[PDB]
Amino acid sequence: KVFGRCELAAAMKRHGLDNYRGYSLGNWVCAAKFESNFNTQATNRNTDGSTDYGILQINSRWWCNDGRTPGSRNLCNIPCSALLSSDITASVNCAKKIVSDGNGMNAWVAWRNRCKGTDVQAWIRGCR
């Protein structure tokens, strides 16, 4: 599924991402745009053999099981394919664990380089 901007904002709010660990809703919508272009089915391979999955590009090295990242962990206790669903519940719940690990939203490279230090409220402007 490819989300609309306000559609995604509303879904993220309902699942409790707004102000989670002090990150306002606009931060999360910005992150999703540049990580996946709002597409739940996005995947990208990394150089070490791991793969990033879903709307927030969660990495198989630590967070989910894809059966082809030998020596990896599965800290969200899910198959990586669960992160590609039209229902974003699994992605949101796993992202909550990631952002809580000590590095905050710096775990998302696109957020650090394209969202951090900007007017992030602009990403939810106009939404009901």
Ligand X SMILES: C[C@@H](O)CN1CCN(CC(=O)O)CCN(CC(=O)O)CCN(CC(=O)O)CC1
Say if residue 119 carries a ligand binding annotation: no
- Which strand (E) or helix (H) includes residue 59? strand 58-59
In the structure encoding, which two tokens stand for residue 123, read together? 């990403």
With binding defined as CB under 6 A, does residue 77 bind ligand X?
no
- Cα(48)–Cα(9) distance, integer angstroms: 32
Q: Residues 19, 103, 118, 121: which binds Na ion (CB under 5 A)?
A: 103
CB 18, min distance to Na ion, A: 18
In the structure encoding, which two tokens stand for residue 2, read together? 């490819």
Active-site residue among 7, 35, 66, 87? 35
- Residue (103 or 118) nearer to Na ion, CB: 103
**Active-site residue flag, 52:** yes
Q: Residues 22, 102, 117, 126: which binds ligand X (CB under 6 A)?
A: 102
Q: Please, how many CA atoms are within 13 Å of residue 39, restricted to the half-sphere of its CB?
A: 10
- Cα(49)–Cα(70) distance, integer angstroms: 9
Q: Tell me how far apart the terminal alpha carbons of the chain are, to the nearest angstrom.
A: 21
Q: Residues 2, 6, 62, 81: which binds ligand X (CB under 6 A)?
A: 62
- Residue (22 or 102) nearer to ligand X, CB: 102
- Report 40-99 residues binding Na ion (CB under 5 A): 98
Contact residues: Na ion, CB under 5 A: 98, 101, 103, 107
